[PDB]
Amino acid sequence: SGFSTEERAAPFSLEYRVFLKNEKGQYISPFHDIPIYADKDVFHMVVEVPRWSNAKMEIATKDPLNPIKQDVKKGKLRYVANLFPYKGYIWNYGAIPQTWEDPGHCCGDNDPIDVCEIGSKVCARGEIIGVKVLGILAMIDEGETDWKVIAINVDDPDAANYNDINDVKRLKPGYLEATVDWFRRYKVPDGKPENEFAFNAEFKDKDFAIDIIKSTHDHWKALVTKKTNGKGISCMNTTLSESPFKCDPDAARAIVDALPPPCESACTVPTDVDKWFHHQK
Amino acid sequence: GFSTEERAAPFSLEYRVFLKNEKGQYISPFHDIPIYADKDVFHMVVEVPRWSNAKMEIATKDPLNPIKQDVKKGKLRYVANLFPYKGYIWNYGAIPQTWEDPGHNDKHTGCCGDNDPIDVCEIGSKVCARGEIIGVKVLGILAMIDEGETDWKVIAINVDDPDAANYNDINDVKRLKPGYLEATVDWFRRYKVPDGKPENEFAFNAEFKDKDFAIDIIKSTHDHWKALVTKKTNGKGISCMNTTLSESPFKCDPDAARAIVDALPPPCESACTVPTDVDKWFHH
């Protein structure tokens, strides 16, 4: 185990918020307060969306304590289209904490580095896991570059057999190809055009991914130590001791409890979240 | 319209779903639902909702033919997730009052019958509930060869689906839902490969015959079913007990249906756990 969750309000409502708590029950920012490494050569990944889900959940980069909230497009909650034949998110999508794609130094998502866990277990939202990195894919998302790290849950029974991109090409054939297809097309059902890829849409190996993750971690270091412009990101955190933005545990308590309490009945998700979507090809 | 009486805990070994008509009297989904819902619209009993993994189906040999979970080798059986699909990529079910009479072969295949009602794949957007009764417009048929038997897979669409009007034959599917039929053929070809049995091949070279051919097959199976439910052909255990068919020897009064249902563990409030192995993929 390691971490726990504090949900606030009903899932899929506008005030639904997922906050992360350490072992001691103290609130923490998933974007700042979770050490990038779980053990040597194992990264923490905060899981934003479970595999085969449709809600677009993500770490609120600009809200205090960086809770996981549901993306909003024009006052209406965002869901991801079911791209035929896939059901929504075909991996556990999430972010590696303590990493920042600096929009300066576009070439910048200004979000944590986005991660695709490809193991068999479908993880829960807000669940913190360890992953061994396996590769990276360089997507250009509407004029900004958002890196997609390919990794696997270190506790998956076969995590030993996977150690670089070719093991994915080998033991789960077509997984990378469908990854590329999904990232290329996920914005087309809104009319908006396809997405491009650097390196001619090929997957770069593990060491290249780790170099990029280290780069984003240095960007994050500079960010959370006041050394580079905070550029709109809420940096409030409860653990970083060498940071100006550290705050007392009860500051986090007050920021959470000032929100609607956790709910019991679950909202009914619209029936359009079940429509397919095809392409002619 | 119709209602459901789920009995025992969902996904346990003794879980059974019975169907009730407008008045709460129980009926068999295999005998008592008219094949036609309206003119040229077929009733479909939904056995498994889209993107589910349990293999549920009408118990052809239990009394009143409830929907129960297939059991293969002492363990309740679920369907493996064929990459890139999540389980059933369509509302899978059966057309009632139809029987794939075994021993009787095919002018268009050679082999004999599923010994089930004719199997149906509904392709609308709405993901239907288990035991829910729907109306469908038939649109085509596929002929799978399963172990020396012909397994007919009818392709249809919910007649109440928001765009059900635009669909009237197989080419409308080829046009408005591209890649859907190809993935259908692939899916039926590859399941149970994660359980070792090899792939399945198809008559007509894995092609879909259009609607008139499908309706020929469906009317054929309905005639076989008539023969079954009027004792004209021996069922070999297929339960013909029913509460409405007036031309039937095996019809039984509503308190018989009451007694056969109430003789089961009552409805549940907790839920059994579906394994995380139901979430494992399977590739290539």
mmCIF file of C-alpha atoms in Angstrom, chain A residues 10-277:
data_model
loop_
_atom_site.group_PDB
_atom_site.id
_atom_site.type_symbol
_atom_site.label_atom_id
_atom_site.label_comp_id
_atom_site.label_asym_id
_atom_site.label_seq_id
_atom_site.Cartn_x
_atom_site.Cartn_y
_atom_site.Cartn_z
ATOM 1 C CA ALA A 10 -20.559 12.780 -5.782
ATOM 2 C CA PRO A 11 -18.424 11.186 -8.521
ATOM 3 C CA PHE A 12 -18.816 12.882 -11.928
ATOM 4 C CA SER A 13 -20.413 16.020 -10.495
ATOM 5 C CA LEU A 14 -18.883 19.466 -10.889
ATOM 6 C CA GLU A 15 -17.669 19.544 -7.272
ATOM 7 C CA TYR A 16 -16.165 16.045 -7.287
ATOM 8 C CA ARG A 17 -12.639 16.236 -5.895
ATOM 9 C CA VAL A 18 -10.091 13.526 -5.081
ATOM 10 C CA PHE A 19 -7.435 14.509 -2.541
ATOM 11 C CA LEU A 20 -4.421 12.364 -1.672
ATOM 12 C CA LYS A 21 -3.377 11.465 1.883
ATOM 13 C CA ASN A 22 -0.048 10.035 3.019
ATOM 14 C CA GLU A 23 0.175 7.104 5.433
ATOM 15 C CA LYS A 24 -0.234 9.439 8.457
ATOM 16 C CA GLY A 25 -3.652 10.698 7.245
ATOM 17 C CA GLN A 26 -2.246 14.133 6.362
ATOM 18 C CA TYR A 27 -3.361 15.717 3.098
ATOM 19 C CA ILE A 28 -0.779 16.049 0.310
ATOM 20 C CA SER A 29 -0.463 17.290 -3.259
ATOM 21 C CA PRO A 30 -0.195 14.384 -5.755
ATOM 22 C CA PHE A 31 1.752 16.745 -8.045
ATOM 23 C CA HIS A 32 4.363 17.764 -5.463
ATOM 24 C CA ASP A 33 4.296 15.582 -2.342
ATOM 25 C CA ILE A 34 4.748 12.069 -3.792
ATOM 26 C CA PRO A 35 8.434 11.165 -4.339
ATOM 27 C CA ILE A 36 9.025 10.381 -8.013
ATOM 28 C CA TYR A 37 10.759 7.116 -7.004
ATOM 29 C CA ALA A 38 9.126 4.324 -4.981
ATOM 30 C CA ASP A 39 12.296 2.227 -4.872
ATOM 31 C CA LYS A 40 15.349 2.206 -7.087
ATOM 32 C CA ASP A 41 14.313 2.053 -10.777
ATOM 33 C CA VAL A 42 10.600 2.201 -9.839
ATOM 34 C CA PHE A 43 8.551 5.366 -10.366
ATOM 35 C CA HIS A 44 5.447 6.462 -8.553
ATOM 36 C CA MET A 45 2.512 6.970 -10.903
ATOM 37 C CA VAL A 46 -0.663 8.685 -9.793
ATOM 38 C CA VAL A 47 -3.434 7.007 -11.759
ATOM 39 C CA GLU A 48 -5.840 9.590 -13.142
ATOM 40 C CA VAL A 49 -8.200 7.380 -15.191
ATOM 41 C CA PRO A 50 -8.778 3.607 -14.845
ATOM 42 C CA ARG A 51 -8.378 1.490 -17.963
ATOM 43 C CA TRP A 52 -11.621 1.237 -19.983
ATOM 44 C CA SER A 53 -13.095 4.363 -18.369
ATOM 45 C CA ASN A 54 -14.489 7.404 -20.150
ATOM 46 C CA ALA A 55 -14.329 10.252 -17.627
ATOM 47 C CA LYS A 56 -11.480 12.684 -18.247
ATOM 48 C CA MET A 57 -9.977 12.954 -14.768
ATOM 49 C CA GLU A 58 -6.677 14.646 -14.033
ATOM 50 C CA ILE A 59 -4.544 16.421 -11.452
ATOM 51 C CA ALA A 60 -5.828 19.988 -11.025
ATOM 52 C CA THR A 61 -2.557 21.708 -11.895
ATOM 53 C CA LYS A 62 -3.786 25.142 -10.784
ATOM 54 C CA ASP A 63 -6.020 24.242 -7.721
ATOM 55 C CA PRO A 64 -4.620 24.097 -4.166
ATOM 56 C CA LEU A 65 -3.315 20.652 -3.115
ATOM 57 C CA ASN A 66 -3.584 19.621 -6.784
ATOM 58 C CA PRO A 67 -6.694 17.439 -6.377
ATOM 59 C CA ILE A 68 -7.891 15.186 -9.167
ATOM 60 C CA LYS A 69 -10.858 16.848 -10.874
ATOM 61 C CA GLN A 70 -12.865 16.259 -14.038
ATOM 62 C CA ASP A 71 -11.930 18.363 -17.078
ATOM 63 C CA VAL A 72 -14.607 20.889 -18.082
ATOM 64 C CA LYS A 73 -15.205 21.999 -21.681
ATOM 65 C CA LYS A 74 -17.688 24.897 -21.835
ATOM 66 C CA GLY A 75 -19.487 24.295 -18.538
ATOM 67 C CA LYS A 76 -20.166 20.643 -19.429
ATOM 68 C CA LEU A 77 -18.033 17.803 -18.085
ATOM 69 C CA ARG A 78 -15.583 16.109 -20.436
ATOM 70 C CA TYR A 79 -15.742 12.463 -21.429
ATOM 71 C CA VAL A 80 -13.509 10.619 -23.882
ATOM 72 C CA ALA A 81 -15.080 9.147 -27.006
ATOM 73 C CA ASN A 82 -15.268 5.382 -27.389
ATOM 74 C CA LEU A 83 -13.014 5.028 -30.419
ATOM 75 C CA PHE A 84 -13.989 1.836 -32.199
ATOM 76 C CA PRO A 85 -12.963 -0.776 -31.309
ATOM 77 C CA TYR A 86 -11.636 0.516 -28.021
ATOM 78 C CA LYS A 87 -13.466 1.223 -24.866
ATOM 79 C CA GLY A 88 -12.275 4.690 -23.967
ATOM 80 C CA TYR A 89 -8.896 4.695 -22.221
ATOM 81 C CA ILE A 90 -7.107 1.475 -23.265
ATOM 82 C CA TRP A 91 -4.555 1.733 -20.440
ATOM 83 C CA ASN A 92 -4.320 3.127 -16.961
ATOM 84 C CA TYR A 93 -3.582 6.745 -17.793
ATOM 85 C CA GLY A 94 -1.955 8.999 -15.251
ATOM 86 C CA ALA A 95 1.042 11.116 -14.324
ATOM 87 C CA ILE A 96 4.488 10.663 -12.801
ATOM 88 C CA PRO A 97 4.668 13.049 -9.818
ATOM 89 C CA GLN A 98 7.354 15.692 -9.322
ATOM 90 C CA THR A 99 7.699 16.255 -13.082
ATOM 91 C CA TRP A 100 6.786 19.296 -15.148
ATOM 92 C CA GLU A 101 6.791 19.863 -18.911
ATOM 93 C CA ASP A 102 7.938 23.471 -18.629
ATOM 94 C CA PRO A 103 6.137 25.603 -21.263
ATOM 95 C CA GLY A 104 9.189 27.839 -21.238
ATOM 96 C CA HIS A 105 12.655 26.383 -21.702
ATOM 97 C CA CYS A 106 5.683 25.706 -27.510
ATOM 98 C CA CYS A 107 7.272 22.497 -26.257
ATOM 99 C CA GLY A 108 5.296 22.495 -23.026
ATOM 100 C CA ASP A 109 2.096 20.917 -21.699
ATOM 101 C CA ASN A 110 2.581 22.681 -18.333
ATOM 102 C CA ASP A 111 1.242 19.454 -16.754
ATOM 103 C CA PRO A 112 2.947 16.484 -15.076
ATOM 104 C CA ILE A 113 4.385 13.943 -17.493
ATOM 105 C CA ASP A 114 1.583 11.715 -18.753
ATOM 106 C CA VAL A 115 1.936 7.979 -18.346
ATOM 107 C CA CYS A 116 0.358 4.844 -19.792
ATOM 108 C CA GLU A 117 0.414 1.765 -17.583
ATOM 109 C CA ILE A 118 -0.275 -1.333 -19.661
ATOM 110 C CA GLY A 119 -0.557 -4.132 -17.114
ATOM 111 C CA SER A 120 -3.549 -6.378 -16.656
ATOM 112 C CA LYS A 121 -4.920 -4.895 -13.423
ATOM 113 C CA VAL A 122 -7.371 -2.019 -13.942
ATOM 114 C CA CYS A 123 -6.354 0.469 -11.244
ATOM 115 C CA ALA A 124 -8.636 2.736 -9.256
ATOM 116 C CA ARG A 125 -8.626 6.521 -9.531
ATOM 117 C CA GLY A 126 -6.251 8.194 -7.094
ATOM 118 C CA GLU A 127 -4.431 4.903 -6.565
ATOM 119 C CA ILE A 128 -0.664 5.391 -6.327
ATOM 120 C CA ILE A 129 1.430 2.654 -7.928
ATOM 121 C CA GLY A 130 4.999 1.822 -8.841
ATOM 122 C CA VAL A 131 5.949 1.365 -12.485
ATOM 123 C CA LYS A 132 9.069 0.321 -14.343
ATOM 124 C CA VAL A 133 9.514 2.547 -17.383
ATOM 125 C CA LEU A 134 9.689 0.899 -20.804
ATOM 126 C CA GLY A 135 9.646 3.659 -23.410
ATOM 127 C CA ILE A 136 8.223 6.966 -24.537
ATOM 128 C CA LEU A 137 6.167 8.369 -27.425
ATOM 129 C CA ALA A 138 6.519 11.978 -28.601
ATOM 130 C CA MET A 139 3.095 13.417 -29.314
ATOM 131 C CA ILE A 140 2.429 16.945 -30.558
ATOM 132 C CA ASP A 141 -0.871 17.945 -28.955
ATOM 133 C CA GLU A 142 -2.299 20.908 -30.871
ATOM 134 C CA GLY A 143 1.005 22.792 -31.126
ATOM 135 C CA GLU A 144 2.425 21.708 -27.754
ATOM 136 C CA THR A 145 4.502 18.571 -27.149
ATOM 137 C CA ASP A 146 3.084 16.232 -24.507
ATOM 138 C CA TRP A 147 5.256 13.177 -23.830
ATOM 139 C CA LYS A 148 3.521 9.829 -23.320
ATOM 140 C CA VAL A 149 5.558 7.484 -21.129
ATOM 141 C CA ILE A 150 4.957 3.754 -21.659
ATOM 142 C CA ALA A 151 5.348 1.760 -18.438
ATOM 143 C CA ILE A 152 4.049 -1.286 -16.539
ATOM 144 C CA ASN A 153 2.870 -1.834 -12.960
ATOM 145 C CA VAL A 154 5.836 -3.303 -11.096
ATOM 146 C CA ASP A 155 3.488 -5.624 -9.167
ATOM 147 C CA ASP A 156 1.917 -7.215 -12.249
ATOM 148 C CA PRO A 157 2.698 -10.973 -12.067
ATOM 149 C CA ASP A 158 4.715 -10.768 -15.313
ATOM 150 C CA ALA A 159 6.520 -7.459 -14.674
ATOM 151 C CA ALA A 160 9.761 -9.458 -14.912
ATOM 152 C CA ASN A 161 9.226 -10.361 -18.580
ATOM 153 C CA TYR A 162 8.943 -6.673 -19.567
ATOM 154 C CA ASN A 163 12.075 -4.528 -19.601
ATOM 155 C CA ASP A 164 12.141 -2.436 -22.814
ATOM 156 C CA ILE A 165 9.873 -1.444 -25.683
ATOM 157 C CA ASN A 166 10.628 -4.585 -27.681
ATOM 158 C CA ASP A 167 9.177 -6.743 -24.895
ATOM 159 C CA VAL A 168 5.905 -4.850 -25.427
ATOM 160 C CA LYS A 169 6.205 -5.293 -29.195
ATOM 161 C CA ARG A 170 6.699 -9.009 -28.381
ATOM 162 C CA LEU A 171 4.376 -10.091 -25.551
ATOM 163 C CA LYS A 172 1.451 -7.696 -26.152
ATOM 164 C CA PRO A 173 1.504 -7.295 -29.944
ATOM 165 C CA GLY A 174 -0.476 -4.427 -31.382
ATOM 166 C CA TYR A 175 -0.534 -2.589 -28.058
ATOM 167 C CA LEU A 176 1.807 0.170 -29.223
ATOM 168 C CA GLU A 177 0.135 0.431 -32.635
ATOM 169 C CA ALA A 178 -3.262 0.875 -30.974
ATOM 170 C CA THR A 179 -1.685 3.359 -28.565
ATOM 171 C CA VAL A 180 -0.545 5.452 -31.530
ATOM 172 C CA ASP A 181 -3.976 5.170 -33.154
ATOM 173 C CA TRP A 182 -5.755 6.248 -29.955
ATOM 174 C CA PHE A 183 -3.544 9.288 -29.398
ATOM 175 C CA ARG A 184 -3.783 10.266 -33.066
ATOM 176 C CA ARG A 185 -7.583 10.134 -33.158
ATOM 177 C CA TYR A 186 -8.930 10.951 -29.698
ATOM 178 C CA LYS A 187 -9.660 14.586 -30.678
ATOM 179 C CA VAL A 188 -11.301 13.903 -34.081
ATOM 180 C CA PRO A 189 -14.830 13.109 -32.709
ATOM 181 C CA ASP A 190 -14.912 16.787 -31.686
ATOM 182 C CA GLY A 191 -14.054 17.775 -35.276
ATOM 183 C CA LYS A 192 -10.682 19.151 -34.232
ATOM 184 C CA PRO A 193 -7.908 17.664 -36.434
ATOM 185 C CA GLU A 194 -5.623 14.659 -35.982
ATOM 186 C CA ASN A 195 -2.503 14.767 -33.819
ATOM 187 C CA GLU A 196 1.047 14.589 -35.155
ATOM 188 C CA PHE A 197 3.982 12.612 -33.779
ATOM 189 C CA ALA A 198 7.710 13.235 -33.709
ATOM 190 C CA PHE A 199 10.284 10.580 -34.662
ATOM 191 C CA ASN A 200 7.762 9.393 -37.269
ATOM 192 C CA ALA A 201 5.426 7.877 -34.622
ATOM 193 C CA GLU A 202 7.967 5.296 -33.427
ATOM 194 C CA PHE A 203 8.502 4.402 -29.762
ATOM 195 C CA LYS A 204 11.862 5.397 -28.294
ATOM 196 C CA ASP A 205 13.454 3.023 -25.814
ATOM 197 C CA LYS A 206 13.687 3.131 -22.031
ATOM 198 C CA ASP A 207 16.884 5.150 -21.501
ATOM 199 C CA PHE A 208 15.528 7.937 -23.711
ATOM 200 C CA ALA A 209 12.313 7.968 -21.672
ATOM 201 C CA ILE A 210 14.306 8.171 -18.437
ATOM 202 C CA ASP A 211 16.361 11.064 -19.812
ATOM 203 C CA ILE A 212 13.143 12.932 -20.619
ATOM 204 C CA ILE A 213 11.653 12.126 -17.207
ATOM 205 C CA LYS A 214 14.797 13.458 -15.514
ATOM 206 C CA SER A 215 14.570 16.643 -17.605
ATOM 207 C CA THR A 216 10.972 17.189 -16.514
ATOM 208 C CA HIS A 217 12.006 16.490 -12.924
ATOM 209 C CA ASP A 218 14.615 19.254 -13.076
ATOM 210 C CA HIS A 219 11.983 21.609 -14.475
ATOM 211 C CA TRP A 220 9.825 20.591 -11.499
ATOM 212 C CA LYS A 221 12.679 21.150 -9.016
ATOM 213 C CA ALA A 222 13.237 24.670 -10.324
ATOM 214 C CA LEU A 223 9.475 25.285 -10.235
ATOM 215 C CA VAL A 224 8.833 24.173 -6.653
ATOM 216 C CA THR A 225 11.947 25.910 -5.307
ATOM 217 C CA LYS A 226 10.909 29.379 -6.629
ATOM 218 C CA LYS A 227 13.907 29.327 -9.024
ATOM 219 C CA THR A 228 11.769 29.548 -12.204
ATOM 220 C CA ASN A 229 8.481 31.314 -12.894
ATOM 221 C CA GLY A 230 5.549 29.456 -11.340
ATOM 222 C CA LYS A 231 3.605 30.216 -14.510
ATOM 223 C CA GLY A 232 0.118 29.811 -13.016
ATOM 224 C CA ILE A 233 0.643 26.441 -11.298
ATOM 225 C CA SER A 234 -0.523 26.207 -7.686
ATOM 226 C CA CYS A 235 2.581 24.993 -5.834
ATOM 227 C CA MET A 236 1.033 24.547 -2.391
ATOM 228 C CA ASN A 237 2.503 21.439 -0.766
ATOM 229 C CA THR A 238 2.775 19.884 2.687
ATOM 230 C CA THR A 239 6.066 17.919 2.604
ATOM 231 C CA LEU A 240 8.741 19.779 0.588
ATOM 232 C CA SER A 241 10.989 21.252 3.293
ATOM 233 C CA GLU A 242 13.384 23.125 0.967
ATOM 234 C CA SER A 243 10.419 24.921 -0.700
ATOM 235 C CA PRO A 244 8.827 28.322 0.015
ATOM 236 C CA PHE A 245 5.372 26.890 -0.744
ATOM 237 C CA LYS A 246 5.335 24.289 2.056
ATOM 238 C CA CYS A 247 2.297 24.600 4.322
ATOM 239 C CA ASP A 248 1.127 23.248 7.655
ATOM 240 C CA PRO A 249 -1.028 20.069 7.621
ATOM 241 C CA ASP A 250 -4.046 21.978 8.967
ATOM 242 C CA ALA A 251 -3.842 24.410 6.072
ATOM 243 C CA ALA A 252 -4.481 21.399 3.843
ATOM 244 C CA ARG A 253 -7.201 20.189 6.231
ATOM 245 C CA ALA A 254 -8.971 23.540 5.965
ATOM 246 C CA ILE A 255 -8.688 23.604 2.187
ATOM 247 C CA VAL A 256 -10.284 20.155 1.960
ATOM 248 C CA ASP A 257 -13.024 20.393 4.595
ATOM 249 C CA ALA A 258 -14.214 23.702 3.091
ATOM 250 C CA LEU A 259 -15.565 21.535 0.201
ATOM 251 C CA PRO A 260 -18.794 19.478 -0.025
ATOM 252 C CA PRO A 261 -18.479 16.207 1.913
ATOM 253 C CA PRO A 262 -18.164 12.765 0.290
ATOM 254 C CA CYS A 263 -21.410 11.483 -1.207
ATOM 255 C CA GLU A 264 -23.112 8.081 -1.240
ATOM 256 C CA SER A 265 -25.461 7.875 -4.219
ATOM 257 C CA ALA A 266 -23.547 7.820 -7.508
ATOM 258 C CA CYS A 267 -24.476 10.071 -10.410
ATOM 259 C CA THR A 268 -25.817 8.580 -13.622
ATOM 260 C CA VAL A 269 -23.321 9.273 -16.426
ATOM 261 C CA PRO A 270 -24.937 10.484 -19.678
ATOM 262 C CA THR A 271 -25.980 7.906 -22.264
ATOM 263 C CA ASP A 272 -23.809 9.598 -24.922
ATOM 264 C CA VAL A 273 -20.769 8.280 -22.984
ATOM 265 C CA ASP A 274 -21.771 4.922 -24.464
ATOM 266 C CA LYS A 275 -21.969 5.826 -28.179
ATOM 267 C CA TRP A 276 -19.254 4.313 -30.370
ATOM 268 C CA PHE A 277 -17.384 6.213 -33.109
#
